[PDB]
Design a protein around this nucleic acid. Structure first.
Length: 41
DNA sequence: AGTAACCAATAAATGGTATTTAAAATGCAAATTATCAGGCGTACCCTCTTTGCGAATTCGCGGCAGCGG
């Protein structure tokens, strides 16, 4: 479908649109996993 | 109201060759103050959205393209 949109801004927004937000639970989940990795090392 | 240029003489006529004198002044490189230029950090919560709107009704020409026997 790509209409050869050479505009880099369009490519950036198209790439970033895929990943979806998640709040109040993930942040805690990922922070815990980061601290766990650091504690392991 | 007194002739000399006679021959010695006198040092003054210069402008030229230098190791000095130390005082100055003139530069020189430190110490020692001001001020400028970087780095870091900030805990309520905030989540694609802004754009260009059109190097702006050109036009004529060419040719490298996709569809098609």
């Amino acid at each position: 479908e790509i209409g050869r949109t050479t505009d880099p801004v369009r490519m950036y927004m198209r790439e970033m649109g895929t990943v979806e937000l998640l709040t109040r639970e993930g942040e805690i989940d990922i922070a815990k996993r980061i601290e766990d990795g650091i504690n392991q090392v």
